[PDB]
Amino acid sequence: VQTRKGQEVLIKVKHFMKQHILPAEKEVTEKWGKPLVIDKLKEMAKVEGLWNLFLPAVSGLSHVDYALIAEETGKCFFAPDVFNCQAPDTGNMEVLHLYGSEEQKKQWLEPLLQGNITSCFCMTEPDVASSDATNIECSIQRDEDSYVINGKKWWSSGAGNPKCKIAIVLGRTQNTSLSRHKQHSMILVPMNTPGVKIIRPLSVFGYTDNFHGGHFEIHFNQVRVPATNLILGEGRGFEISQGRLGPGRIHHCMRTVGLAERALQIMCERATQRIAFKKKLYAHEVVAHWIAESRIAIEKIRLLTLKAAHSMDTLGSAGAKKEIAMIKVAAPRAVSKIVDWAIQVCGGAGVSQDYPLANMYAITRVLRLADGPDEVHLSAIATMELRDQAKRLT
Amino acid sequence: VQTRKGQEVLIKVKHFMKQHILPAEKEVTEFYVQNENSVDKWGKPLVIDKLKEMAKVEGLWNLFLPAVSGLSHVDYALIAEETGKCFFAPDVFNCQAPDTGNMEVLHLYGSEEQKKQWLEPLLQGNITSCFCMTEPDVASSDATNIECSIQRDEDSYVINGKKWWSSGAGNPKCKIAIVLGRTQNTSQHSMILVPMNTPGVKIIRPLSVFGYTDNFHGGHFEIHFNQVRVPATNLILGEGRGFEISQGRLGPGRIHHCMRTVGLAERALQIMCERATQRIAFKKKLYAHEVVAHWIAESRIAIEKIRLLTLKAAHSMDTLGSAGAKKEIAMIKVAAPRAVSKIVDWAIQVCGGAGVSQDYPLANMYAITRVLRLADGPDEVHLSAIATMELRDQAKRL
Amino acid sequence: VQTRKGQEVLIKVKHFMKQHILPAEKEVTEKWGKPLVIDKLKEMAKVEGLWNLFLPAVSGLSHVDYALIAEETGKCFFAPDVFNCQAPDTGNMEVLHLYGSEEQKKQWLEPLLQGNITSCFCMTEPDVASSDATNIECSIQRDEDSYVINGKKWWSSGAGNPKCKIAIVLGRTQNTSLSRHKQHSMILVPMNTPGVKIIRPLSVFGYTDNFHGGHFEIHFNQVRVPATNLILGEGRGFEISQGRLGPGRIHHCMRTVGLAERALQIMCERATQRIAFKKKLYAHEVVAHWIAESRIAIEKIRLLTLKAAHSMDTLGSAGAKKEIAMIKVAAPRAVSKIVDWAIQVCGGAGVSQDYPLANMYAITRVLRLADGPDEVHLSAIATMELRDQAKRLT
Amino acid sequence: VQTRKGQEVLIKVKHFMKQHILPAEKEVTEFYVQNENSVDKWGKPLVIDKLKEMAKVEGLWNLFLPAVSGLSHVDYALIAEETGKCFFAPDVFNCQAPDTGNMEVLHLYGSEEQKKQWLEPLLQGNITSCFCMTEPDVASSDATNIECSIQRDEDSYVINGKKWWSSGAGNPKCKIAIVLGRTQNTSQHSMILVPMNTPGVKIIRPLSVFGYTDNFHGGHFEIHFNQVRVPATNLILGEGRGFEISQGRLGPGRIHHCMRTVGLAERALQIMCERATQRIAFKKKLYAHEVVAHWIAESRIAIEKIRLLTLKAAHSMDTLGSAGAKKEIAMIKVAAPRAVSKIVDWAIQVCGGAGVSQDYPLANMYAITRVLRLADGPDEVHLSAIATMELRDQAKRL
């Protein structure tokens, strides 16, 4: 099931969580960068080797092994960072790991693995429906030695971070000899390149997410980068984005299971601390049944997350397409519902700064959109099902 | 069936909304945006004042109060629906919460002195008020849990307790508080007027809703009551009458929120359809993706259902009073917030990432509806009351 | 609101229900025709004038007036018949009333109004998706004096009834000079015409519905009818079906409100007669909340039914298109849910012959399909909404 | 992780299903159809017998019982899923309810004489049995309500009471009943073997499920117990042990139903996709209407969820026993029937009018799943148990 290394590392992560991270929550909870405790915590994690756990080729962990670890990190908003496991940097690391040239890795992959710099992924554009990636019009043109980039991007997570020195950008390479689906490319763009302008931060229900901060509109005004900044090859844009978003999708879902287990904990502590109409709240059967329904949902999605991870292990993330889609739909909406019941049990306190539930709700709502909206994944599953259904009849 | 006056005033409100209020939205929003989460800005820009004055001149003012407006509850429901389409519209006609409820409490139960002193300034929009019932340390959905102490020595009352979620306390104009506390007796609760500048009243901190502080109506505060002494004549109606008065005020409170919510929904669906026609994904406009189409249709169905149920309730209040319409108010209080919540959430989804952003009012709209499943009584509590009432009526008929 | 006549007639229907119909339920409940009591009951209704109430031009009732009456009939499975208000005969009467020639009315409309014969509507075909009416391929061809009909029809309700002497049939009149949407016609076909063959009955969850009996596959094998049997004109098929199904749709929904009010009654009687875990069942809060949710749903749909009726009164059934669609979607699924909770409260008894809930569930499930499936109505509403939404911006 | 034997036997079952069982479905159905609602036909056509014999020869028999099959619960779950795709498949491998539960009750608690007399013939498929717990006159979901009287005079027991929903009683082979009654004592319930031919046992009437009588497994009966006398040695295990034994049997009962339901669902989704490709409406195949597409996708998601949760539960039973897996069995008992119910209902909708007709197995499939939200314990009861267990585990960890 789990590997022996996987079991040991999980045990180590749990200890670290209980003994260092969680005791630091109060303070960290109570400007687009991170307080010094985050740094001391990172250093400690490095020493005990709890670092880059998300990357098999470095961690020596299977995706099954990591799922249980990632679940644990999901119980705390700054946990993934401490182990260098946070988005959008994990996906960006994977992109370079799988497709980067040797020069590209020496320059960017190494610093990222070290936690020296951060990065942002730039795909979504305000002026076009970006859920259909073929709509992307951010222009990339080629003169002999270099590429010129022009366009608008938004929702770039993490751009506010002064350490964010590098951007991975998806654009159109208009080419008349290639087909409609081979019209896009991925290119490295250093944040300090002339013509790169960060315009404004974007809120999520009036959170700005300063801590991971944040989410930005970035314009690309005549930016020139060396041809050697292109990733893999011209026309390979969609391929690379599929390569990175597969893990991206699954890491978010693993974390969500931990999020949910935290919500249900908060829900039960609360339902026992409050007397209304001469009964503790858990004695009102409707509240009881929310607790129960939440337990059922968590088990279902943890299992479906594990199934997906196990597919990746044995098929690679392309071959696990269907299972990743399934968990990407299931997880955020189920956990969203759990958080919302938890908020309801907490009364007015549920929407307040006094609990982490309102934040938790914002995170889960957004995951029905980020890394691809539910509806898009559902259509992909329907297509895939109808193919498999056709196969079994041949 | 609407009244003739009701029809005329509705027409007037529509012609004010289109011609004055809505064209001011762009600017008022730019003000709301810059001041959200401000430590110190809890009031309104001058346009709100100019707008209020204009409304006074045309008589569009205090429309929510029959004994002043000469309007039925049915008449107002349609009007309030229209105000719901803009976050500052109810204020312009002096129809905003928590002030409408507080005014009604004084109108029905206030002594002549109490009215002359507080009801009058509120009716002019000179001051504002806040209602103080909810307490952090006890489950306040069961009102009998309220422990905020009220004790009596001859000429006065002494008040000690904690209150929170007091809406509007941050606005400097908020000079008066209506408070619910325990008056221990044999053989438990009272409502009392407390001026905000009374020694011992301390405003502790603002409270956020998904990280919105609601500065514009601002906002929602924890208030402590530390040995505050008020005149015995500040008591409303009588000792032991707390629950009665809160029922008296929250009935309309509940229904006014629902009426506004119908307008909120209609606005979401408009935003949803404009958007669904402006975006091409996978070689179609988004409304051509049948799943989106069916959210539009499901929305229309839900609005019609809840508008009618709002009207049914209003019509009950007209012919039964708000005590006799208990059941119908409960029904709409449950139905409306959750339905419109769902409509807003689909509208957000249709808008993509923009739907949670500051570029649309949907994220705010969602927060408002979410909070209405809690404020003025949580769904679960109203459901239980309906079940009890249903089983009584069910017993009656057999 | 209601008219004075409407109020009086409702009062009369309630009395009749309580005093004659309902006391007969036991027996009628405890072969495709009806027992003699049904006949004696019909005769009594005629004498007191409680007959054809569904038809304004005869009853002098508004659609609002009838909605409340139809609601009352919905509380008993044989009630609509007693007042001559049952489908498919009401729709068939309306079709002749609005579009029949004088000869056609003298021959068919009169007997039906009298309750002497019954009729069936034949639109749905097994071999094509009949929810898109343009798919209908049942052939209608013309030689000089007469029409020849060839095709298959199924789900013809009431065909088993020995009194069913007449069929209203929707077929294709292939005509090269008309457009795709003008290719269909409606034609009267007497059941005893050579070439008309009733093939087999169809069950609904293994009910055959003998009482209204039933639902049949009918084949049309070279049937010849006089040209004067055509309704209104060649090419007008869709128009006539819209003309008849509008009321059809709304009458079914009115009846459903009464059905629901019966289910909730059964649910509450039961929830008070049963002690489980030391409490009556209504004291288990989850059961309480089903009762409450059911009350809420009934009020919503009764109101939406009334809104629809009131539109018909003031706009005609074409102009009320949108409101009829809205209630057609809302009603059957909501009431379906109420019946299903009622079944759950009744335990094993809920699915049994000992209650009318299992039948009630079958009726409501089927109304999500008959007179047009939910999905089709939802699409129509979306189209209409987007038009109205466009209007308000001009 | 499956065992090697488990893998081999699964392969065999698949190769029997495709080659013998499924090709017999057409005919067996024609038999089911003609005999549904028959007053007097409660047994099975001869092909079922030939099929049973063939299975015996290849060893595909009693697969549900580890101590005989040598299979783990995980191993069987996959097998039972396969049986679920055909209404007569579990019988062919002697894996049908209520007989599997009754066999387990004797296997775990039966005395040597009891086994030799009843367990043996059942294991051969010579006789059948029925379980008698539910009583019409009391809410039987709370087992302590059972009033069916059992009294003791020296050498024997006297039984008086009403029972209903006794599945299979109509089949002539049903020679034995396992009965739960009250043994009044201080300081309440017992299980007792009752042969069907005992004087005083009267089968009253069959019960329908949406007007299906279930003749094939036939069927479900009300049985009265009018002064029936049995030997004291007919008691199972001991006086006072009723609840224990019912828990002992219903644990597997619950889980076997769920495993079969996964196969039921997979069959619905297959029917749904074949249909959605065979019908053109509004110029598209039905799967091209995005709403239908999303029901297909939602179905796939639900199946994977419940299969995994079934496997999790099975794996618990393997490592904890069925008492120690209480929680996980409860979870799957709630989750499975309602999810698959929804899948079947969407499949019906996709099929149009045909979906409620005798031309498809969907209407039957719906009835089966609906009944599983009641049988072996209603959802609501299992939900409450989960809540209680969750709050205990939640207390443990803190």
Ligand SMILES: Cc1cc2nc3c(=O)[nH]c(=O)nc-3n(CC(O)[C@H](O)[C@H](O)COP(=O)(O)OP(=O)(O)OC[C@H]3O[C@@H](n4cnc5c(N)ncnc54)[C@H](O)[C@@H]3O)c2cc1C
């Ligand atoms: C907190 C947050 C962080 C983000 N971080 C990043 C980032 O780091 N990098 C980045 O490139 N982007 C990022 N995004 C944005 C993002 O991923 C997109 O918003 C998402 O992919 C949808 O793009 P869109 O806003 O253009 O929606 P649109 O393309 O305009 O579509 C909007 C809605 O249409 C519907 N829809 C689309 N197609 C179909 C269909 N076939 N059938 C039925 N319905 C359909 C969906 O409901 C969809 O949400 C982030 C977004 C949020 C909220």
Ligand SMILES: Cc1cc2nc3c(=O)[nH]c(=O)nc-3n(CC(O)[C@H](O)[C@H](O)COP(=O)(O)OP(=O)(O)OC[C@H]3O[C@@H](n4cnc5c(N)ncnc54)[C@H](O)[C@@H]3O)c2cc1C
């Ligand atoms: C934006 C906002 C503005 C507000 N403004 C005001 C104001 O102006 N004045 C004021 O006095 N208060 C105000 N409040 C707060 C308020 O009304 C309460 O939060 C709410 O009514 C319940 O109080 P509580 O937090 O104590 O919930 P609790 O009483 O602790 O109960 C918590 C949860 O238990 C559940 N529950 C309770 N009883 C039952 C039952 N019998 N059966 C099943 N479930 C049950 C409910 O789901 C409930 O939400 C405001 C709140 C918000 C969010």
Ligand SMILES: Cc1cc2nc3c(=O)[nH]c(=O)nc-3n(CC(O)[C@H](O)[C@H](O)COP(=O)(O)OP(=O)(O)OC[C@H]3O[C@@H](n4cnc5c(N)ncnc54)[C@H](O)[C@@H]3O)c2cc1C
């Ligand atoms: C109890 C009962 C009585 C009946 N009585 C009559 C009668 O008296 N006369 C008569 O002519 N018919 C009658 N019918 C049948 C009937 O009305 C049809 O079955 C219904 O119109 C659908 O036709 P169909 O069976 O061909 O479904 P299909 O056309 O093959 O379509 C099946 C399913 O496709 C889906 N669908 C269709 N279009 C869309 C879309 N645009 N988008 C998304 N989903 C879509 C729906 O879910 C639909 O149900 C009766 C049916 C029942 C169950």
Ligand SMILES: Cc1cc2nc3c(=O)[nH]c(=O)nc-3n(CC(O)[C@H](O)[C@H](O)COP(=O)(O)OP(=O)(O)OC[C@H]3O[C@@H](n4cnc5c(N)ncnc54)[C@H](O)[C@@H]3O)c2cc1C
């Ligand atoms: C097809 C079929 C086959 C069957 N076969 C058998 C058999 O072979 N042997 C046998 O002994 N029985 C059998 N039964 C019947 C059976 O199991 C019962 O019907 C069921 O377990 C409950 O019994 P009841 O009808 O008395 O429901 P009740 O006990 O009267 O309770 C009714 C409803 O109340 C609700 N409820 C109960 N407790 C609570 C609570 N604490 N909180 C909230 N809600 C609550 C539930 O929703 C429940 O369904 C069969 C039933 C069917 C439909």
